[PDB]
């Protein structure tokens, strides 16, 4: 049988979204695939933490009752869920420099801008910003109001990438 | 049995056709073999991403709900179905170098020629380009109009290769 | 069947409080997780001691007849089980220094305070000591009686940390 | 359930007879050991090809409808399935050199001879070729018609090897 | 369940008392825990030997048939029950060095004194020797005739150690 | 379930008794603990060999029918089972040199002399040979006919080892 003896991955607490999301997703899919009940899951929790997360868990052990709130607390204390104005300040900080590919740039900008509350920004508003911030090497060939959707910007960008 | 715990293949976002096609082939074969349900396959999908493509998947999580739409969304950004004139200029940008076997050559040529729109070329036209493009080790013993079907070219090539 | 085959957590007698406390905690959680019965755990005890301590278990084996007395003996012979007065004279012992993240300080304070007997200190009393101990980079803009819940201290400290 | 999840033996197309023969042998023994049925093995075939060959399987997939024809195609496209006459003109090709252990020579000769069709050569016929190719450090004291069984050659060769 | 497949502990043949006693203790505890039959334990015994002791076990395989006789044969050659005058000359060849805790000292002294014939020393005779052996950090505050039982010496030592 | 997919140890064929004995013992205890039948065991045999043992097995595959003869052949071809006169020549070759312990010497001599046919040599002949093969540093203090059994030689040797 076995229940939370060890795992392939463990936790370290390094103040990053990707590591804690990978850890919590691997823990959830292991709990789903093994068949462990919810009552057995919380009691076998302190075998996972090894770094200074375990002296964090030594403090707030009595604060949690069920598996849901105890899993919610791990997202609350280590992932900051930043407010609005810092994210809005962050997008207008770094202009696109030279010798950088357009695709990774728009990829990083979309991953940065996806953290806002949903329903505030459709594809028209999002589409204004990338064209507005590109170098003059891109802005000469493609104008605004030609690229309606979001795929067409990358589509006309790759052709000017090819010729260069 | 199984709910997509962990497997061998992984993705990087290299922007080549071969790795992206191999990844989709391996995942779509494993899903049909192991017997994983259609809804349950999507919840285990960000366990495979490891790289710049995690930044990609974080931006378009709200776009796809069905597994087929997520598969087409994975195909659309990386392997973009480049137009015809790039392929036609690419099939003539490389001749056959010496001491190279005919099998890997005809495999790469068919894999590069299969990107065209289907129904635009018969069997005879493809057979013409392959005979003309080969090294003069083969053209002096294999003349045109002997072979018609695409298998007899390899059949008459491997004998001359074995004879050396 | 199967009880106490092997694991990573082994004990060696290094005369420090942290290592013996982590060992006793890990064994005590493993006993409740795996379901090992009380009377059967005493037989499989020297599979863990592979150190100088296996010489020690040959000397004082006959003093223990139950699992609780054996655990208390293993605590008593190696760890002096520090009382409350040294904890209270050790909490105010050190202050907060410059350029230190507030989360590490709060985690250290709660981890050092959770060893007290449970039920003697509610939430209002614990907060005052941490507020008093805080660095005057934090105490100028965050006064007492504005915070009630323990989360409010971290939530108002992160803004002053970001403001710089 | 479960059929062809993963293993160490993977195929890459390295154009050498030894690697493809070891791969076909290992897959053929795994099929009989694990109990994978005949019709179900064709679906789980491209989980092994993670190389240039996964491009090759997209080209010629429709030529195979059974497992035997697929195995023959995988043999035919990469390995020229050497006939008997090259084996007989390659066995006498090399002799025995000085300071060589007799066991390695007999193992090489039997491994190179076992690829012949079974039932055409009994035990008396094989002995003649090995005896003829023996290094005259061995042929002076061990003449023909003293040995009958194949073990007698090694058993009388080890004494002359030890005598030095 | 289990028929002695593989475990953690292993033997080397170091010719010290502690490692040889720890090995026999671990094996005799594992045999009683896992439920391995008396005859079946001997057939899996040369899987544990790794060293010069394999050369030892190859010589005396025909000597033992029962597990108890094989255990005594393993005890007889390595830990040879050295005579009394070596132990009596050894218990006085080492005084107590400074900054050394009393627990490891009394543990090593009892483990070295337990090699004597039992029934040759009462409880009173051991205590005087331990008192004579100790550093003058302890003798000035703990005088003779205060302690009688062997536990009260450690009880009156740990308080002076905590006071420092 | 599983049956001979892989193992912890595999085979290499390095002309040594200890390696092939360890391999054959691990294979036998794995077959006993897993519950594999005898018919399934021979068919799953060629997954183990990786070195030049596999081209040895490619020759003699048809020579074996059952598991017993196929396991007997592995001891026959790789372990030489030396005859009498070479073993009798080997024991009188190397005299005991200086600064060498008596115990490892008599251990190596017993492991060498145990390979003879059983019943030819009791304990009286062996003691005389051991007395005969030692330096004058040992022969002065202990004479023949004082040490009746075999333990007493080591017993009186360790005392002259101690004083030296």
From Swiss-Prot, chains A, B, C, D, E, F:
The keyword Cell membrane does not apply. The keyword Chloroplast does not apply. Its main location: membrane. GO terms for cellular component: extracellular vesicle; membrane; virus-like capsid. One of its GO terms (molecular function) is structural molecule activity. Keywords: Membrane, RNA-binding, Transport. It is found in: Extracellular vesicle membrane. Belongs to the ARC/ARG3.1 family. Self-assembles into virion-like capsids that encapsulate RNAs and mediate intercellular RNA transfer. Arc2 protein is released from cells in extracellular vesicles that mediate the transfer of mRNA into neighboring cells. The protein is evolutionarily related to retrotransposon Gag proteins. It contains structural elements found within viral Gag polyproteins originated from the Ty3/gypsy retrotransposon family and retains the ability to form virion-like capsid structures that can mediate mRNA transfer between cells. Tetrapod and fly Arc protein-coding genes originated independently from distinct lineages of Ty3/gypsy retrotransposons. Homooligomer; homooligomerizes into virion-like capsids. This is Activity-regulated cytoskeleton associated protein 2. It comes from Drosophila melanogaster. The gene is Arc2.
């Amino acid at each position: 049988k076995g229940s939370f003896s060890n795992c392939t991955v463990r936790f370290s607490g390094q103040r990053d979204h990707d590591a804690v999301d990978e850890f919590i997703n691997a823990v959830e899919t292991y709990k789903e695939v093994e068949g462990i009940s919810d009552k057995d899951a919380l009691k076998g929790l302190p075998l996972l933490f090894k770094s200074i997360a375990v002296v964090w868990w030594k403090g707030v052990r009595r604060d949690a009752k069920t598996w849901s709130d105890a899993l919610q607390l791990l997202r609350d204390h280590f992932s900051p869920t930043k407010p609005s104005y810092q994210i809005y300040m962050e997008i207008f900080e770094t202009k696109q420099s030279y010798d950088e590919v357009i695709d990774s740039f728009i990829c990083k900008q979309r991953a940065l801008l996806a953290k806002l509350p949903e329903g505030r920004h459709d594809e028209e508003t999002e589409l204004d910003f990338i064209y507005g911030l590109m170098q003059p090497k891109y802005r000469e060939s493609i104008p605004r109001h030609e690229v309606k959707t979001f795929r067409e910007l990358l589509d006309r960008g790759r052709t000017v990438e090819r010729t260069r």
